[PDB]
Write an enzyme that holds these catalytic residues in place. Sequence first.
Site, PDB file in Angstrom:
ATOM      1  N   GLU A  35     142.185  96.962  65.177  1.00 52.29           N
ATOM      2  CA  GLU A  35     141.362  96.245  64.211  1.00 52.29           C
ATOM      3  C   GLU A  35     141.568  96.841  62.822  1.00 52.29           C
ATOM      4  O   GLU A  35     141.876  96.087  61.902  1.00 52.29           O
ATOM      5  CB  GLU A  35     139.911  96.220  64.688  1.00 52.29           C
ATOM      6  CG  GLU A  35     139.681  95.270  65.856  1.00 52.29           C
ATOM      7  CD  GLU A  35     139.673  93.772  65.596  1.00 52.29           C
ATOM      8  OE1 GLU A  35     139.828  93.378  64.455  1.00 52.29           O
ATOM      9  OE2 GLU A  35     139.516  92.982  66.583  1.00 52.29           O
ATOM     10  N   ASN A  46     139.708  86.367  56.726  1.00 51.59           N
ATOM     11  CA  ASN A  46     140.020  85.451  57.813  1.00 51.59           C
ATOM     12  C   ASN A  46     140.446  84.112  57.204  1.00 51.59           C
ATOM     13  O   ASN A  46     140.068  83.823  56.073  1.00 51.59           O
ATOM     14  CB  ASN A  46     138.821  85.331  58.756  1.00 51.59           C
ATOM     15  CG  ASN A  46     138.464  86.640  59.435  1.00 51.59           C
ATOM     16  OD1 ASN A  46     137.306  87.063  59.415  1.00 51.59           O
ATOM     17  ND2 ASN A  46     139.448  87.276  60.053  1.00 51.59           N
ATOM     18  N   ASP A  48     139.394  81.251  57.766  1.00 52.38           N
ATOM     19  CA  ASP A  48     138.226  80.411  57.546  1.00 52.38           C
ATOM     20  C   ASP A  48     137.510  80.798  56.249  1.00 52.38           C
ATOM     21  O   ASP A  48     136.516  80.168  55.888  1.00 52.38           O
ATOM     22  CB  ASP A  48     137.273  80.435  58.753  1.00 52.38           C
ATOM     23  CG  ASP A  48     136.714  81.795  59.149  1.00 52.38           C
ATOM     24  OD1 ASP A  48     137.197  82.809  58.617  1.00 52.38           O
ATOM     25  OD2 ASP A  48     135.792  81.830  60.005  1.00 52.38           O
ATOM     26  N   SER A  50     135.913  83.752  55.701  1.00 48.43           N
ATOM     27  CA  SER A  50     135.088  84.917  55.994  1.00 48.43           C
ATOM     28  C   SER A  50     135.919  86.192  55.863  1.00 48.43           C
ATOM     29  O   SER A  50     137.149  86.136  55.746  1.00 48.43           O
ATOM     30  CB  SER A  50     134.497  84.817  57.369  1.00 48.43           C
ATOM     31  OG  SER A  50     135.504  85.066  58.343  1.00 48.43           O
ATOM     32  N   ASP A  52     136.319  90.339  57.487  1.00 45.96           N
ATOM     33  CA  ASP A  52     136.064  91.344  58.502  1.00 45.96           C
ATOM     34  C   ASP A  52     135.920  92.736  57.877  1.00 45.96           C
ATOM     35  O   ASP A  52     136.797  93.125  57.092  1.00 45.96           O
ATOM     36  CB  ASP A  52     137.233  91.333  59.485  1.00 45.96           C
ATOM     37  CG  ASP A  52     137.211  90.107  60.383  1.00 45.96           C
ATOM     38  OD1 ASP A  52     136.105  89.499  60.514  1.00 45.96           O
ATOM     39  OD2 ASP A  52     138.284  89.767  60.934  1.00 45.96           O
ATOM     40  N   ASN A  59     132.542  90.526  61.325  1.00 45.13           N
ATOM     41  CA  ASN A  59     132.825  89.302  60.607  1.00 45.13           C
ATOM     42  C   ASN A  59     131.594  88.866  59.819  1.00 45.13           C
ATOM     43  O   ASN A  59     130.503  88.774  60.388  1.00 45.13           O
ATOM     44  CB  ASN A  59     133.229  88.234  61.625  1.00 45.13           C
ATOM     45  CG  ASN A  59     133.712  86.935  61.019  1.00 45.13           C
ATOM     46  OD1 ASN A  59     133.275  85.870  61.444  1.00 45.13           O
ATOM     47  ND2 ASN A  59     134.661  86.979  60.096  1.00 45.13           N
TER      48      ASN A  59
END
Length: 129
Positions: A35, A46, A48, A50, A52, A59
């Site tokens: 990660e 991300n 979309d 968003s 992280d 998220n």
Amino acid sequence: KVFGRCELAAAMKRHGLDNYRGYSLGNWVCAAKFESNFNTQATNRNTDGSTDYGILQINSRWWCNDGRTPGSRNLCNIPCSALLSSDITASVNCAKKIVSDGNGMNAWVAWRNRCKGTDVQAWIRGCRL
Ligand SMILES: [Cl-]
């Protein structure tokens, strides 16, 4: 802070993740490696929109509030900035709601695709807890 593997392993057990909902410690450490590379400051966008956050890449869509995520839930009731601390408490506390949800550790894409069904034991080998 970029943790050492064994250092994060220790921090994670201290915070009670070892075998948390059946997920042995090596899983959490494996998830962290892919990660964030064990880096508390790590941020990734991300597709979309968003973002992280942190060593477990939590998220903004659902779990933290970064001010700029559409209609976005803040289910751990924290600013995403909290998750970039050298102190992992807030990340860990948030990860427990996440994992208790329903889909377990599959909510971490990198865990599903890279850690799940592997020898995750190796991730804590040689680490004094
Ligand atoms: Cl599960």
